[PDB]
């Protein structure tokens, strides 16, 4: 009964889909049964209609239902992700990746969902590769990385091979669509907490709704300068997800003594340049990049706390203390070194 | 210009800049657009809501790439009778029947046409079933027009470069802005027409495109949804003359037309719809004849607008259309059309 003309017609009529229709569509896409034209029409039509949390949740659900999972009982109940949509139009250093290393060094289990560049000069995966970290590990070895090192990296194309038809279309049309939301929503380890960047201000709330439905503890963040991270150049909008509900907040780092930075102070380069930036921060270099890394690490720790009960300002103060200490003690630098060793000993 | 630029502008619900729609269409027409890009553009353009300028650019590009007719072979007063189709009703081929009657009345007709998309039989299918050569090239359409009084430009024959767009249309199977282009891309470029639009909220856009060309056109939408002048109720007419458009409500009851039911205009496959043509041309009285005469008269009114007064124009149109059938001229013109193609 479901068909492309039905679903696409409903969307072009600016109507929300019926329950299960978005899922049907995504499943057709993920099983190689959709024509490129159908994939593109669907992505564009959903985007222009304004996707609902129900709809985006169905898309992400289908992706997760096809993904390679991690082995049973290898992901702690309190694992966290630090990942964004990307596509903010700014070539920054890899802030989520740097933050993730610091969070893990603070003792919070991290299973990060990641990928190579799409529109930037160096993606988190590119940069980790340049640092000597193995980005190509399957379920079993990601699980061992998490256990042994404190952090695992799930390379999206490795865990989502059936997404390859959609990815090709995303590339061909260029324009961001609802598909650009799915990465942060489809970590195959299914961590229940996260700091989740959204480049698209008008779609952050919908992302937050999806996390709320699965009762995650997440901060969905959009820098008011456009960054899909908590920014240091100005305020950030946060959609705070806890206990199945979303509430919208504005966050000002000046409240925690952060000086305002300029966006060009966070600029990145190629994989080697961004790798150097990771080494500089973990080595104790003070300055704007460190500040942005500590701020986002703290945010992820706050999300982790919310799995409990948790109070906002004490949570942030503790998160900032822990993030800063994880760098200052050398723990974060050492953790990266241990991560690199781990991959070379497989 | 680029796909990310243009698609991004559309997904931001912004009208395009001058020339951008044309750039896009030309990419599509030169085989330089990926199916995904074709599909994204068609959907994005549709959901943003296209403007007359934009649709005009699209049609302009198609006409640039189309096979033209030979110089000085289309009369300045040639008329088209063609609609968007996709009105969700499987009717007999009212435009095609009206076209024959109009030609038989002596008004030069160069009809743009095609096979079925959503229906059981398109005008081209029905003409084929009647024995008409539908796939003639430019030289022979011009001869048909001169010698028979009607020519049929088969869209696939004259718009080869459109095949990639056509394939994507079929694949996504939902109407888009592309569904507006048929009536706007007759390669003979007739300056008058009776032009049906299934999509009430886009008829004004189509009328705007014709206004830009200073065509004399009646863009029509039956208030029952028909992409023809209907006989079951009133119709909306976007009348185009002197580069301006005015919206009218039209009731054929004012000309003595009894109200019909939509089911009475229902059609079927090419053989059945061909039989309906033969029936009407043979003098059969009924709702189908009425609808044919009404739309034939509409086209004659548009032809007259190249120069007349509205109500007198309609009276004359109805008279000429009825007489074209009743004298047998219409039936004989069809026979002559068939013989032409065989020789
Ligand atoms: O090249 P763009 O278009 O900007 O997209 C990149 O940002 C995404 C999220 O990046 P991450 O948040 O995972 O990592 P990071 O912030 O850089 O450390 C990555 O999947 C990558 O596709
Ligand atoms: O099958 P659907 O979806 O209805 O579309 C058909 O109607 C178009 C216009 O038809 P016409 O107006 O040219 O001819 P007609 O009214 O039928 O005599 C044709 O190109 C054909 O694609
Ligand atoms: Mg960026
Ligand atoms: Mg990030
Ligand atoms: Mg119809
Ligand atoms: Mg018609």
XYZ file of C-alpha atoms and ligand atoms in Angstrom:
737
model
C 0.000 0.000 0.000
C 2.821 2.490 0.697
C 4.416 3.932 -2.456
C 6.698 6.745 -3.542
C 3.913 8.675 -5.302
C 1.802 8.471 -2.152
C 4.538 9.551 0.254
C 6.089 12.186 -2.032
C 2.621 13.523 -2.878
C 1.765 13.841 0.786
C 5.003 15.739 1.453
C 4.630 18.070 -1.552
C 1.115 18.803 -0.237
C 2.917 20.069 2.904
C 1.344 17.345 5.053
C 2.948 15.382 7.867
C 3.358 11.733 6.982
C 1.213 8.952 8.426
C 2.810 6.783 11.090
C 5.228 4.331 9.482
C 5.536 6.105 6.125
C 8.865 7.754 6.831
C 10.132 4.389 8.078
C 8.901 2.649 4.908
C 10.740 5.193 2.806
C 14.003 4.946 4.725
C 13.845 1.160 4.601
C 13.411 1.244 0.805
C 16.384 3.569 0.676
C 18.499 1.359 2.950
C 17.695 -1.872 1.053
C 18.808 -0.487 -2.314
C 15.218 -0.486 -3.612
C 14.907 3.274 -4.210
C 15.862 5.091 -7.391
C 18.316 7.979 -6.839
C 15.543 10.332 -7.990
C 13.169 8.930 -5.341
C 15.822 9.255 -2.630
C 16.479 12.881 -3.609
C 12.786 13.798 -3.900
C 12.124 12.362 -0.484
C 15.027 14.098 1.251
C 14.191 17.444 -0.309
C 10.423 17.191 0.203
C 10.717 16.247 3.835
C 13.121 19.076 4.451
C 10.878 21.684 2.853
C 7.722 20.403 4.562
C 9.507 20.749 7.965
C 10.191 17.297 9.388
C 8.606 16.291 12.672
C 10.361 14.478 15.501
C 8.133 11.478 14.806
C 9.320 11.415 11.201
C 13.003 11.907 11.889
C 12.765 9.313 14.656
C 11.409 6.799 12.148
C 14.313 7.501 9.779
C 16.903 7.081 12.533
C 15.142 3.949 13.821
C 15.328 2.263 10.427
C 19.019 3.133 10.187
C 19.691 1.708 13.654
C 17.677 -1.402 12.839
C 20.054 -2.067 9.891
C 23.295 -0.981 11.604
C 26.013 -3.327 12.851
C 25.486 -3.375 16.631
C 28.153 -3.669 19.318
C 28.280 -6.984 21.227
C 25.823 -7.527 24.074
C 26.813 -5.901 27.366
C 29.864 -4.057 26.028
C 28.463 -0.527 26.246
C 28.019 0.990 29.726
C 24.604 2.375 30.555
C 26.168 5.817 30.935
C 28.257 6.015 27.751
C 28.231 9.398 26.025
C 28.656 10.695 22.492
C 30.027 14.058 21.355
C 28.960 14.631 17.776
C 27.385 17.208 15.470
C 25.634 17.469 12.127
C 28.628 19.222 10.675
C 27.969 21.592 7.793
C 28.211 24.824 9.777
C 30.079 26.505 6.902
C 33.068 27.135 9.155
C 36.301 25.181 8.901
C 37.208 24.818 12.541
C 39.532 22.525 14.395
C 37.784 19.276 15.358
C 36.167 20.404 18.575
C 33.874 17.420 19.277
C 36.749 15.012 18.766
C 39.043 16.937 21.093
C 36.241 17.232 23.628
C 35.544 13.484 23.417
C 39.145 12.628 24.302
C 39.026 14.943 27.352
C 35.662 13.519 28.522
C 36.968 9.949 28.331
C 40.111 11.033 30.193
C 37.814 12.389 32.893
C 36.462 8.838 33.393
C 33.219 9.116 31.417
C 32.838 6.305 28.902
C 32.730 7.717 25.352
C 31.558 5.973 22.240
C 31.893 8.575 19.538
C 30.119 8.412 16.212
C 32.296 9.917 13.525
C 33.041 10.416 9.859
C 35.364 11.982 7.336
C 34.917 15.513 6.005
C 31.884 16.257 3.834
C 32.280 20.016 3.281
C 35.293 20.768 5.529
C 39.062 20.351 5.065
C 39.376 17.634 7.759
C 36.694 15.577 9.479
C 37.073 14.152 12.953
C 37.840 10.738 11.448
C 40.499 12.231 9.134
C 42.147 13.959 12.069
C 42.075 10.870 14.313
C 43.648 8.884 11.479
C 46.404 11.526 11.256
C 46.995 11.106 14.977
C 47.582 7.388 14.528
C 44.239 6.318 15.952
C 42.494 3.419 14.209
C 39.201 4.631 12.731
C 38.436 1.360 10.916
C 37.477 -0.962 13.775
C 34.416 -3.208 13.736
C 31.974 -3.907 16.616
C 34.191 -6.269 18.634
C 37.284 -4.083 18.576
C 35.339 -0.868 19.244
C 33.948 -2.635 22.322
C 37.507 -3.574 23.388
C 38.700 -0.005 22.774
C 35.944 1.293 25.046
C 36.810 -1.213 27.789
C 40.579 -0.928 27.592
C 41.110 2.752 26.678
C 37.902 4.441 27.881
C 36.826 5.533 24.402
C 35.651 3.825 21.237
C 35.185 5.366 17.801
C 32.381 4.146 15.535
C 33.199 5.145 11.970
C 29.768 5.677 10.429
C 30.428 4.056 7.023
C 31.797 0.984 8.833
C 28.664 0.522 10.915
C 26.083 1.765 8.375
C 27.014 0.109 5.063
C 23.406 0.115 3.826
C 23.359 3.929 4.025
C 25.674 4.095 1.003
C 22.825 4.715 -1.431
C 21.591 7.730 0.558
C 25.130 9.085 1.095
C 25.744 9.156 -2.655
C 22.577 11.194 -3.236
C 23.437 13.566 -0.353
C 26.745 14.223 -2.098
C 25.186 14.674 -5.545
C 22.593 17.268 -4.499
C 24.892 19.124 -2.096
C 22.163 21.023 -0.249
C 21.622 19.992 3.407
C 18.485 17.936 3.962
C 16.840 16.005 6.793
C 19.510 13.320 6.092
C 22.120 15.678 7.609
C 20.416 15.202 10.998
C 20.805 11.452 11.097
C 24.486 10.969 12.030
C 24.153 12.132 15.656
C 20.897 10.178 15.927
C 22.317 6.861 14.692
C 25.332 5.983 16.841
C 25.256 2.181 16.535
C 26.358 1.777 20.187
C 23.181 3.625 21.197
C 24.669 5.693 24.021
C 21.965 7.235 26.218
C 23.775 10.525 26.721
C 25.366 13.089 24.442
C 26.432 16.557 23.521
C 24.886 16.960 20.090
C 25.746 19.803 17.723
C 23.229 21.039 15.162
C 24.301 23.497 12.445
C 20.707 24.160 11.454
C 18.984 26.320 14.037
C 15.506 25.478 12.722
C 16.062 21.729 13.091
C 17.723 21.493 16.533
C 14.373 21.270 18.277
C 13.322 18.352 16.062
C 16.589 16.568 16.885
C 15.962 17.191 20.567
C 12.476 15.689 20.171
C 13.929 12.458 18.782
C 16.291 12.103 21.736
C 13.415 12.918 24.096
C 11.347 10.098 22.629
C 14.096 7.585 23.418
C 14.579 9.209 26.886
C 18.194 10.129 26.315
C 20.027 12.715 28.385
C 21.283 15.114 25.742
C 22.167 18.709 25.160
C 21.421 19.622 21.591
C 23.516 22.715 20.900
C 23.714 25.417 18.224
C 26.228 28.276 18.610
C 24.502 31.618 17.943
C 27.414 32.275 15.587
C 26.448 29.200 13.531
C 28.773 26.585 15.096
C 27.459 23.054 15.659
C 29.221 23.129 19.035
C 28.990 25.235 22.173
C 30.808 28.326 20.960
C 33.130 30.715 22.746
C 32.481 33.691 20.437
C 28.970 34.462 21.779
C 25.946 32.671 23.250
C 24.717 29.185 22.268
C 21.169 27.897 22.144
C 20.701 24.619 23.998
C 17.756 22.278 23.719
C 18.080 20.358 26.990
C 16.656 16.840 26.922
C 15.928 15.107 30.227
C 13.117 12.894 31.571
C 11.527 12.716 28.099
C 11.041 16.465 27.761
C 12.827 19.304 26.015
C 13.407 22.803 27.250
C 15.101 25.564 25.385
C 17.861 27.574 27.016
C 20.438 30.133 26.028
C 23.950 29.552 27.380
C 26.524 32.295 27.935
C 30.139 31.197 28.639
C 30.856 34.624 30.130
C 28.873 33.286 33.096
C 31.752 30.894 33.784
C 34.504 33.394 33.142
C 35.182 32.621 29.497
C 36.449 35.557 27.470
C 34.819 36.088 24.074
C 36.822 34.590 21.236
C 36.797 35.357 17.514
C 35.669 32.614 15.158
C 38.938 32.860 13.184
C 40.790 31.880 16.378
C 39.220 28.391 15.988
C 40.116 27.953 12.313
C 41.366 24.569 11.139
C 43.369 23.277 8.196
C 44.086 19.864 6.718
C 44.273 16.617 8.689
C 47.882 17.267 9.699
C 47.114 20.810 10.836
C 44.135 19.664 12.887
C 46.108 16.774 14.368
C 48.722 19.300 15.473
C 45.944 21.286 17.088
C 44.848 18.243 19.117
C 48.427 17.683 20.295
C 48.793 21.365 21.294
C 45.614 21.384 23.375
C 46.262 18.066 25.096
C 49.788 19.300 25.798
C 48.499 22.194 27.869
C 48.579 25.059 25.342
C 46.403 27.880 26.672
C 44.211 29.915 24.388
C 40.921 29.965 22.486
C 41.026 26.383 21.209
C 41.594 24.984 24.735
C 38.732 27.129 25.998
C 36.323 25.741 23.366
C 37.467 22.160 24.032
C 36.997 22.505 27.831
C 33.607 24.122 27.379
C 32.303 21.322 25.150
C 33.872 18.570 27.281
C 32.080 20.125 30.248
C 28.820 20.091 28.279
C 29.146 16.386 27.570
C 29.852 15.744 31.225
C 26.695 17.710 32.108
C 24.711 15.517 29.711
C 26.212 12.450 31.396
C 25.184 13.806 34.807
C 21.588 14.216 33.619
C 21.229 10.457 33.409
C 20.629 10.881 37.145
C 18.574 14.507 40.280
C 21.182 16.667 38.520
C 21.311 20.454 39.108
C 22.342 22.731 36.202
C 24.927 25.185 37.621
C 26.600 22.712 39.982
C 26.694 20.273 37.064
C 28.415 22.833 34.857
C 30.884 23.828 37.544
C 31.823 20.198 38.148
C 32.009 19.519 34.399
C 34.390 22.445 33.905
C 36.557 21.365 36.872
C 36.731 17.814 35.574
C 37.479 18.793 31.969
C 40.203 21.207 32.947
C 41.752 18.708 35.372
C 41.717 15.953 32.753
C 43.950 18.128 30.557
C 46.022 19.646 33.337
C 46.977 16.342 34.976
C 48.098 14.964 31.631
C 45.327 12.368 31.656
C 43.939 13.425 28.254
C 47.356 13.459 26.570
C 48.115 10.040 28.036
C 44.755 8.653 27.027
C 45.390 9.569 23.371
C 48.792 7.902 23.566
C 47.231 4.784 25.043
C 44.523 4.839 22.348
C 47.174 4.943 19.625
C 49.066 2.062 21.234
C 45.866 0.023 21.544
C 45.311 0.124 17.794
C 48.894 -0.813 16.983
C 48.691 -3.894 19.253
C 45.650 -5.483 17.559
C 25.808 29.042 -10.568
C 25.711 25.603 -8.977
C 23.296 22.999 -7.707
C 24.121 23.740 -4.074
C 23.526 27.447 -4.671
C 20.222 27.045 -6.483
C 18.782 24.178 -4.441
C 19.819 25.935 -1.233
C 18.033 29.083 -2.315
C 14.873 27.092 -3.017
C 15.014 25.129 0.258
C 15.248 28.517 1.960
C 11.882 29.277 0.291
C 13.362 32.105 -1.761
C 12.531 33.015 -5.338
C 15.445 32.429 -7.661
C 17.581 35.208 -9.136
C 17.076 36.100 -12.796
C 18.644 33.421 -14.962
C 19.034 30.744 -12.295
C 15.987 28.691 -13.284
C 17.220 28.851 -16.863
C 20.701 27.670 -15.806
C 19.194 24.716 -14.003
C 16.927 23.737 -16.885
C 19.767 23.966 -19.382
C 21.906 21.643 -17.200
C 18.974 19.224 -17.150
C 18.484 19.525 -20.927
C 22.142 18.953 -21.861
C 22.441 15.678 -19.931
C 24.726 17.373 -17.384
C 22.385 16.885 -14.420
C 22.347 13.754 -12.281
C 18.895 12.204 -11.788
C 19.131 13.172 -8.089
C 19.807 16.791 -9.058
C 16.906 16.814 -11.534
C 14.593 15.419 -8.856
C 15.754 17.801 -6.115
C 15.234 20.800 -8.379
C 11.787 19.727 -9.557
C 10.567 19.087 -6.001
C 12.218 22.168 -4.488
C 10.844 24.422 -7.185
C 7.351 22.955 -6.635
C 7.306 23.310 -2.880
C 8.729 26.840 -2.879
C 5.883 27.742 -5.307
C 7.229 28.724 -8.708
C 6.822 32.207 -10.126
C 5.807 33.112 -13.683
C 9.357 34.386 -14.320
C 10.817 31.062 -13.187
C 8.441 28.864 -15.165
C 8.991 31.162 -18.141
C 12.742 30.540 -17.871
C 12.201 26.798 -17.757
C 9.982 26.805 -20.820
C 12.330 29.223 -22.590
C 15.228 26.811 -22.236
C 13.157 23.899 -23.550
C 12.156 25.956 -26.541
C 15.811 26.867 -27.157
C 16.697 23.189 -27.451
C 13.584 22.087 -29.304
C 13.413 21.262 -33.017
C 11.816 24.364 -34.553
C 9.413 24.260 -37.483
C 10.748 25.550 -40.795
C 10.790 29.331 -41.267
C 7.464 30.897 -42.336
C 5.385 27.688 -42.007
C 3.342 28.452 -38.873
C 0.612 31.083 -39.485
C 0.686 34.083 -37.110
C -2.798 33.074 -35.894
C -2.175 29.349 -35.211
C -3.787 27.988 -32.007
C -3.052 25.219 -29.515
C -5.582 23.262 -27.447
C -3.668 21.495 -24.672
C -3.685 21.046 -20.919
C -1.455 19.940 -18.091
C -3.350 16.703 -17.690
C -3.277 15.017 -14.277
C -6.656 16.350 -13.162
C -7.399 12.993 -11.530
C -10.196 12.243 -13.987
C -10.042 9.756 -16.851
C -12.101 11.575 -19.462
C -12.364 11.277 -23.201
C -9.728 13.389 -24.925
C -11.604 16.664 -24.968
C -8.698 18.817 -26.125
C -7.866 16.527 -29.023
C -11.505 16.416 -30.187
C -11.830 20.171 -29.773
C -8.618 20.641 -31.796
C -10.035 18.721 -34.766
C -13.277 20.742 -34.688
C -11.379 24.072 -34.455
C -9.191 23.151 -37.436
C -12.266 22.092 -39.381
C -13.739 25.519 -38.682
C -10.704 26.965 -40.501
C -8.564 28.081 -37.573
C -4.973 26.779 -37.987
C -4.163 24.321 -35.164
C -0.745 23.097 -34.125
C -1.335 20.914 -31.164
C 1.344 19.932 -28.776
C 0.639 16.521 -27.346
C 1.793 13.334 -25.735
C 0.828 9.862 -24.604
C -0.899 9.062 -21.304
C 0.887 9.750 -18.048
C -1.730 9.121 -15.335
C -4.726 8.336 -17.581
C -5.698 5.286 -19.667
C -5.206 7.076 -22.988
C -3.485 10.346 -23.864
C -4.308 12.495 -26.873
C -1.357 11.033 -28.749
C -2.495 7.462 -27.994
C -6.003 8.263 -29.163
C -4.824 9.963 -32.373
C -2.656 6.913 -33.035
C -5.633 4.610 -32.546
C -7.495 6.744 -35.106
C -4.729 6.199 -37.650
C -3.072 9.618 -37.411
C 0.716 9.813 -37.724
C 1.678 11.366 -34.427
C 5.483 11.305 -34.690
C 6.140 13.516 -37.703
C 9.216 15.748 -37.835
C 9.279 19.553 -38.348
C 9.035 19.546 -42.155
C 6.069 17.188 -42.213
C 4.174 18.837 -39.327
C 4.444 22.042 -41.367
C 3.053 20.268 -44.429
C 0.247 18.730 -42.368
C -0.658 22.181 -41.103
C -0.675 23.654 -44.594
C -2.415 20.795 -46.358
C -4.795 19.438 -43.722
C -5.204 22.454 -41.443
C -3.791 20.809 -38.337
C -0.353 19.596 -37.258
C 0.557 17.486 -34.225
C 3.878 18.030 -32.500
C 4.662 14.927 -30.449
C 6.504 16.157 -27.370
C 9.088 13.337 -27.307
C 9.806 13.878 -31.031
C 10.490 17.614 -30.720
C 12.037 17.714 -27.229
C 14.626 14.881 -27.325
C 16.860 16.603 -24.784
C 14.006 16.424 -22.255
C 14.271 12.656 -21.953
C 16.257 12.844 -18.697
C 13.702 15.132 -17.089
C 10.917 12.872 -18.389
C 12.508 9.771 -16.849
C 12.751 11.461 -13.415
C 9.116 12.667 -13.622
C 8.032 9.058 -14.104
C 10.243 7.808 -11.264
C 8.969 10.205 -8.618
C 5.401 9.899 -9.935
C 4.099 13.038 -8.228
C 3.234 16.278 -10.076
C 5.892 19.008 -10.070
C 6.522 22.274 -11.840
C 7.561 20.108 -14.838
C 3.843 19.240 -15.280
C 3.207 22.871 -16.259
C 5.645 22.937 -19.157
C 3.800 20.933 -21.869
C 1.328 23.675 -22.793
C 4.143 26.236 -22.561
C 6.637 24.503 -24.860
C 4.784 23.901 -28.129
C 7.734 24.007 -30.568
C 5.594 25.714 -33.252
C 5.141 28.595 -30.783
C 1.515 29.394 -31.615
C 0.414 32.763 -30.310
C -3.029 31.655 -29.191
C -4.479 28.825 -27.208
C -7.038 27.215 -24.970
C -4.929 25.962 -22.119
C -6.207 23.742 -19.349
C -4.579 23.627 -15.941
C -5.387 20.886 -13.403
C -3.713 22.795 -10.599
C -5.975 25.682 -9.583
C -3.227 27.435 -7.633
C -0.839 27.418 -10.618
C -3.173 28.467 -13.435
C -2.366 32.148 -12.714
C 1.342 31.336 -13.025
C 0.814 29.695 -16.420
C -1.287 32.663 -17.509
C 1.576 34.939 -16.495
C 3.977 33.042 -18.760
C 1.653 33.498 -21.731
C 1.171 37.162 -20.824
C 4.925 37.635 -20.998
C 4.813 36.329 -24.575
C 1.813 38.491 -25.378
C -0.115 35.404 -26.370
C -3.891 35.429 -26.695
C -4.779 32.605 -24.359
C -7.589 31.381 -22.148
C -6.114 29.444 -19.252
C -8.981 27.392 -17.863
C -9.755 25.372 -14.768
C -13.113 23.693 -14.327
C -14.472 24.343 -10.844
C -14.968 20.573 -10.740
C -11.204 20.157 -11.224
C -11.234 19.499 -14.965
C -8.263 20.845 -16.986
C -10.763 21.973 -19.653
C -13.806 24.227 -19.742
C -16.326 22.040 -17.962
C -20.065 21.534 -18.414
C -20.766 20.192 -14.910
C -20.390 23.563 -13.230
C -18.631 26.911 -13.635
C -15.017 27.364 -14.741
C -12.302 29.823 -13.822
C -10.726 31.493 -16.834
C -7.502 33.438 -16.625
C -7.912 35.494 -19.774
C -4.643 36.617 -21.359
C -4.625 39.476 -23.846
C -2.489 42.569 -24.460
C 0.112 41.258 -22.001
C -2.354 41.338 -19.094
C -4.312 38.687 -17.178
C -7.780 38.925 -15.666
C -9.545 36.185 -13.675
C -13.122 35.402 -14.797
C -15.848 33.002 -13.690
C -17.526 31.411 -16.700
C -20.870 29.581 -16.787
C -21.845 27.759 -19.982
C -25.492 27.697 -18.832
C -25.567 31.259 -20.082
C -25.148 29.810 -23.589
C -27.803 27.121 -23.129
C -25.581 24.265 -21.970
C -27.317 21.825 -19.687
C -25.429 20.681 -16.581
C -23.701 17.327 -17.052
C -22.238 14.893 -14.520
C -18.491 14.310 -14.593
C -18.932 10.533 -15.065
C -20.671 11.241 -18.399
C -17.333 12.503 -19.799
C -15.475 9.365 -18.642
C -13.138 7.613 -21.046
C -11.062 4.453 -21.211
C -8.302 3.031 -23.377
C -7.209 4.335 -26.742
C -9.690 2.169 -28.639
C -12.628 3.394 -26.537
C -11.516 7.025 -26.662
C -11.014 6.751 -30.394
C -14.562 5.422 -30.592
C -15.692 8.473 -28.637
C -14.027 10.731 -31.213
C -15.748 8.923 -34.087
C -19.067 9.179 -32.250
C -18.831 12.931 -31.654
C -17.581 13.672 -35.159
C -20.416 11.570 -36.574
C -23.025 13.838 -34.978
C -23.878 12.024 -31.743
C -25.700 14.365 -29.363
C -24.896 14.299 -25.673
C -22.689 15.615 -22.883
C -19.443 14.714 -24.706
C -20.418 16.709 -27.812
C -21.407 19.615 -25.571
C -18.013 19.632 -23.867
C -16.195 19.398 -27.186
C -18.190 22.247 -28.720
C -17.676 24.434 -25.628
C -13.897 23.956 -25.665
C -13.659 24.293 -29.449
C -15.514 27.592 -29.053
C -13.096 28.614 -26.325
C -10.129 28.124 -28.641
C -11.848 30.137 -31.378
C -12.449 32.904 -28.827
C -8.719 32.865 -28.006
C -7.952 32.995 -31.729
C -10.233 36.014 -32.075
C -8.464 37.727 -29.187
C -5.392 38.078 -31.372
C -7.355 41.135 -32.601
C -13.207 41.379 -30.619
C -15.929 41.491 -27.947
C -16.292 38.678 -25.381
C -19.929 37.539 -25.601
C -20.207 37.955 -29.385
C -16.905 36.069 -29.706
C -18.371 33.159 -27.741
C -21.586 33.105 -29.768
C -19.576 33.033 -33.012
C -17.234 30.375 -31.617
C -20.133 28.130 -30.589
C -21.785 28.604 -33.973
C -18.610 27.780 -35.907
C -17.820 24.736 -33.769
C -21.321 23.250 -33.992
C -21.412 23.805 -37.749
C -17.978 22.230 -38.236
C -19.344 19.022 -36.704
C -22.838 19.165 -38.212
C -21.681 19.709 -41.809
C -19.322 16.767 -41.505
C -16.316 19.031 -41.981
C -14.731 17.828 -38.751
C -15.252 14.146 -39.584
C -13.850 14.737 -43.075
C -10.843 16.666 -41.783
C -9.921 13.675 -39.585
C -10.186 11.359 -42.602
C -8.013 13.725 -44.616
C -5.529 13.858 -41.769
C -5.236 10.063 -41.801
C -4.815 9.961 -45.582
C -2.118 12.633 -45.434
C -0.002 10.480 -43.148
C -0.358 7.456 -45.427
C 0.896 9.435 -48.404
O 32.772 18.413 6.749
P 31.400 18.813 7.434
O 30.326 19.148 6.435
O 31.460 20.039 8.243
O 30.915 17.502 8.243
C 31.849 16.945 9.171
O 31.297 17.346 10.575
C 30.583 16.053 11.012
C 30.499 16.085 12.544
O 31.800 16.263 13.043
P 32.087 15.745 14.517
O 31.253 16.462 15.494
O 31.845 14.292 14.667
O 33.632 15.989 14.749
P 34.367 17.345 15.061
O 33.470 18.380 15.641
O 34.884 17.945 13.784
O 35.555 17.021 16.035
C 31.352 15.092 10.568
O 30.608 13.872 10.429
C 31.865 15.645 9.093
O 30.924 15.140 8.135
O -2.585 11.025 -18.700
P -2.580 12.430 -17.970
O -1.943 12.446 -16.606
O -3.962 12.881 -17.709
O -1.744 13.440 -18.923
C -2.225 13.442 -20.272
O -2.943 14.809 -20.417
C -1.868 15.652 -21.150
C -2.607 16.813 -21.829
O -3.622 16.242 -22.625
P -4.219 17.047 -23.869
O -4.819 18.318 -23.442
O -3.134 17.419 -24.812
O -5.207 16.118 -24.646
P -6.682 15.668 -24.274
O -7.378 16.640 -23.394
O -6.652 14.408 -23.469
O -7.385 15.492 -25.666
C -1.341 14.806 -22.007
O -0.025 15.198 -22.450
C -1.264 13.391 -21.147
O 0.030 13.321 -20.534
Mg 32.354 23.100 10.486
Mg 31.471 18.488 16.166
Mg -7.910 13.813 -16.920
Mg -6.776 18.429 -22.545
